[PDB]
Amino acid sequence: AVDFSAHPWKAPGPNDSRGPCPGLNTLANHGFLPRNGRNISVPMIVKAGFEGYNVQSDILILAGKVGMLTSREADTISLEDLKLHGTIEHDASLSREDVAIGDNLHFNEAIFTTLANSNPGADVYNISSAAQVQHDRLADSVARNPNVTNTDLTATIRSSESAFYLTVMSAGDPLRGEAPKKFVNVFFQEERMPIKEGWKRSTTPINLPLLGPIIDRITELSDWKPTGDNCGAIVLGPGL
Amino acid sequence: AVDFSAHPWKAPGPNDSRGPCPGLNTLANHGFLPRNGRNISVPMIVKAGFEGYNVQSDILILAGKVGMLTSREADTISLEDLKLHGTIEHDASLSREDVAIGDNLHFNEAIFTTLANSNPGADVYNISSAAQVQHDRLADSVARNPNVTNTDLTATIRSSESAFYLTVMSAGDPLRGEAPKKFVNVFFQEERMPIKEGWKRSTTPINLPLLGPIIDRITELSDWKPTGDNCGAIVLGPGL
Ligand code: HEM
Ligand code: HEM
Ligand SMILES: CCCCCCCCCCCCCC(=O)O
Ligand SMILES: CCCCCCCCCCCCCC(=O)O
Ligand SMILES: *[C@@H]1O[C@H](CO)[C@@H](O)[C@H](O)[C@H]1NC(C)=O
Ligand SMILES: *[C@@H]1O[C@H](CO)[C@@H](O)[C@H](O)[C@H]1NC(C)=O
Ligand SMILES: *[C@@H]1O[C@H](CO)[C@@H](O)[C@H](O)[C@H]1NC(C)=O
Ligand SMILES: *[C@@H]1O[C@H](CO)[C@@H](O)[C@H](O)[C@H]1NC(C)=O
Ligand SMILES: *[C@@H]1O[C@H](CO)[C@@H](O)[C@H](O)[C@H]1NC(C)=O
Ligand SMILES: [Mg+2]
Ligand SMILES: [Mg+2]
């Protein structure tokens, strides 16, 4: 029963907190989360993701409580807190630079080129294109970042994020694991719901059972291999 | 400014959730946390630890948000949820069995014998006795549990727990890193504040700066070495 017309996109001001996640950033830019990006709890994320995207509480509780670790507060974050490297934030992002060699927070068009140019000859991104992008992004980090971290955990998180953009920005059947380029590009480049472009919130719930096989197929097609430590240890709080 | 007369010890009833932590169990048994042990948030833990023990928000926010990972709820746990192996719960506990070979949840008198018998000829437990206990408990797990997990992280958590019993149950100067056996034994065996025995809440705040040197000294005296891959990865949620 959400009224999207009561949730206009507004550009964030210079002091509105935004993070490395286009999903949460977009929700804030439409006021599903606080536009200032501050004082955000897991219940707020659960509600916002449901209302905005029809993403269910299973994934948002699991991911949300991990995200909470990035702040110094008892039960809230600022979106910018999520840039904390090695909690969720990882190398070989789709649209951000690796923290060791650049800006791990803001959208970067040069990084995004790989995704933007994927699935040549189609007007959608899909599971095979998403896998290719992941392969190529990881190769770039291995080439250029002397502090690169690549573990089973980061690889899984990366495939989860690719599954998110394929499903949440779909043309309405998220099971298909494909999304119009026009919608995904707006999502990343503007952190806006592409409403005027024709996007509508999925009428199918997006939950762990739906995402699981998509995640696994993306991983499988990405020709991923362990390269190093492979210990899936997360950073448990800031300033440790 | 805490009225302990308004916080009597009551034995947990059959539907009351209790976990592997004597600290939180004791707070629940005195109603500083809900006596039913359910729907417990990090803000509730922060307040309860302050009121009951003069433990500060630094450690309780950090540990509390990690503890939140153990439930399926957005921002609360039941105390029993904390038994989830490999989040905080670990092998070589002071008063519980290793999950692979026994009950990792309930107080176990046979396990507790090692701590109870430590520091012979004194009426206190102290840093050297706590270190000996940790050495002996870990040795027991290495002997009897083929699946033992023993890492920098579990070792730190274990010394933190020893530091907690030495400080929170002290005779009122937690800096000393020694606690009356009569107080610590009641804490573990009954999950009760030993008020009739003469214990009083510390007038000195117990925070990370106070605990840190105690933790480090316990580790130093314990003749510790890691096991296997020494991977500090935590379990990020239940049913994975
Ligand atoms: C529990 C809620 C969420 C948390 C805590 C969260 C956290 C994060 C974090 C920290 C990152 C940065 C990882 C990195 O690239 O280094 C990220 C990336 C991403 N998230 Fe979220 N996220 C959440 C929900 C969502 C939702 C609902 C979507 C919906 C589409 C989404 C889509 C993405 C995408 C596509 C990326 C990849 C960005 C890139 O690689 O450049 N997230 N998330
Ligand atoms: C408030 C002050 C606290 C005190 C004094 C305290 C004390 C202790 C002690 C002494 C143990 C060791 C029990 C043993 O080895 O048999 C322990 C274990 C544990 N504590 Fe706490 N604790 C406190 C707060 C917390 C908090 C905030 C959390 C998480 C929300 C937590 C979670 C646990 C867990 C999961 C264990 C089990 C680890 C294991 O032995 O395997 N504790 N605690
Ligand atoms: C088991 C994979 C489910 C997808 C979870 C990805 C969300 C990333 C945040 C971290 C929370 C759990 C991570 C994980 O188990 O993959
Ligand atoms: C210097 C901090 C030591 C105290 C940590 C107590 C353990 C809390 C549970 C896990 C949360 C952080 C992990 C850790 O650094 O020990
Ligand atoms: C943050 O949110 C809580 C819960 O709604 C509220 O009590 C508090 O006043 C808020 N603080 C700020 C600075 O907005
Ligand atoms: C993705 O789209 C390309 C181009 O249409 C196609 O070759 C490929 O088979 C598709 N992959 C999947 C998984 O649908
Ligand atoms: C990063 O890699 C460089 C070059 O190998 C090394 O000096 C450094 O210790 C590594 N760690 C970090 C994060 O600085
Ligand atoms: C409180 O915790 C219970 C599990 O003990 C859970 O079912 C519930 O969602 C939480 N809040 C309530 C009562 O809705
Ligand atoms: C602990 O107490 C014993 C027995 O009195 C004593 O020998 C030992 O030195 C004490 N250790 C510390 C750290 O005070
Ligand atoms: Mg990144
Ligand atoms: Mg244990």
Q: In this structure, how many other beta carbons lie within 10 angstroms of the beta carbon of residue B240?
A: 7
- φ/ψ region of A215 (left if φ > 0, alpha if ψ in -120 to 50, else beta) reads alpha
Distance (angstroms) between ligand 8 centre and the Cα of B61 equals 21
Q: How far is A145 from chain B (nearest CA, A)?
A: 23
Per this entry, what is the length of chain A? 240
Q: Identify whether A105 is part of a domain.
A: yes
Q: For residues A59 and B155, give the distance between their C-alpha atoms in angstroms, rounded to a whole number.
A: 31
At CA A205, angle to CA A202 and CA A210, rounded to 5? 110
Residue B89, strand partner residues? B85
Q: How far is B195 from chain A (nearest CA, A)?
A: 30
Q: Identify whether A61 is part of a domain.
A: yes
- Which experimental technique did the depositors report for determining this structure? X-ray
Is any atom of ligand 7 closer than 6 Å to the C-beta of A144? no
Residue whose CA is closest, atom 8 of ligand 7?
A147
Of A149, A153, A155, A164, the C-alpha closest to A99 is A149
A81, A85, A89, A93 alpha-carbon torsion, rounded to 10°: 130
Distance (angstroms) between ligand 8 centre and the Cα of A36 equals 30
DSSP string, A180-199: EHHHHHHHHHH----TTTT-
Name chain A contacts of B41, Cβ cutoff 8 Å: 74-75
Residue A77, strand partner residues? A40
Q: Identify whether A99 is part of a domain.
A: yes
Is any atom of ligand 3 closer than 6 Å to the C-beta of A62? yes
Q: Identify whether A236 is part of a domain.
A: no
Of B45, B35, B51, the C-alpha closest to B168 is B51
Both structure tokens of B157: 């958590």
Residue whose CA is closest, atom 4 of ligand 4?
B160
Both structure tokens of A181: 């380029």
Of B30, B20, B153, B26, the C-alpha closest to B94 is B20
B10, B15, B16, B20 alpha-carbon torsion, rounded to 10°: 120
CATH of residue A33: 1.10.489.10
Both structure tokens of A103: 């800006």
Q: For residues B236 and B79, give the distance between their C-alpha atoms in angstroms, rounded to a whole number.
A: 17
Q: Identify whether B112 is part of a domain.
A: yes
Residue range(s) defining the domain that contains residue A86 = 17-221
- φ/ψ region of A92 (left if φ > 0, alpha if ψ in -120 to 50, else beta) reads left
Burial status of residue B150 (CB atoms within 10 A of its CB: 0-12, 13-18, 19 or more): buried
Pocket test for ligand 4, best of B57, B89, B160 (most atoms within 8 A of CB): B160
Ligand nearest to the backbone CA of A218: 6
Going from the C-alpha of A47 to that of each of A7, A53, A58, A168, A188, the distances in angstroms are 14, 10, 12, 15, 22
- Which of A57, A58, A68 is best to mutate for the B interface (most B CBs within 10 A)? A68
Ligand nearest to the backbone CA of B76: 8
Those residues whose C-beta lies under 8 Å from the C-beta of residue A135, and which sit 6 or more positions away, are A222, A223, A224
Contact A22, A49 (CB under 8 A): no
Burial status of residue A7 (CB atoms within 10 A of its CB: 0-12, 13-18, 19 or more): middle
Those residues whose C-beta lies under 8 Å from the C-beta of residue B138, and which sit 6 or more positions away, are B92, B150, B158, B222, B224
Is any atom of ligand 9 closer than 6 Å to the C-beta of B221? no
**Secondary structure, 3-state, B189-238:** HHCCCCCCCCCCCCCCCECHHHHHHHHHHHHHHCCCCCCCCCCCCCCCCC
Those residues whose C-beta lies under 8 Å from the C-beta of residue A229, and which sit 6 or more positions away, are A149, A151
Count of the separate structural domains present in chain B:
1
Task: Check if A74 contacts B (Cβ < 8 Å).
Answer: yes
CB contact under 8 A, A61 and B74: yes
Of A108, A101, A87, the C-alpha closest to A188 is A108
Angle between helices B152-168 and B127-144 in degrees, nearest 10: 140
Q: Identify whether A62 is part of a domain.
A: yes
Nearest CA in chain B to A73: B61
Per this entry, what is the length of chain B? 240
Q: Identify whether A239 is part of a domain.
A: no
Of A103, A119, A88, A108, the C-alpha closest to A221 is A119
Single-letter amino acid, residue A119 = N
What residues line ligand 6, using a CB cutoff of 6 Å?
A 119, 121-122, 126-129
CB contact under 8 A, B42 and A72: no
Among candidates A69, A75, A231 on the partner chain, residue whose Cβ is nearest the Cβ of B232: A231
* A45-58 core/surface letters (b: 16 or more CB in 10 A; e: else): bbbbbbbbbbbbbb
Write the DSSP symbol of residue B239: T
**B18 — phi, psi (to 5°)?**
-135, 155
Task: Check if B209 contacts A (Cβ < 8 Å).
Answer: no
Task: Check if A73 contacts B (Cβ < 8 Å).
Answer: yes
Write the DSSP symbol of residue B31: T
Of A8, A81, A4, A9, the C-alpha closest to A40 is A81
Q: Identify whether A233 is part of a domain.
A: no
Is any atom of ligand 7 closer than 6 Å to the C-beta of A147? yes
Q: What is the resolution of this structure in A?
A: 1.6
Both structure tokens of B177: 């890193």
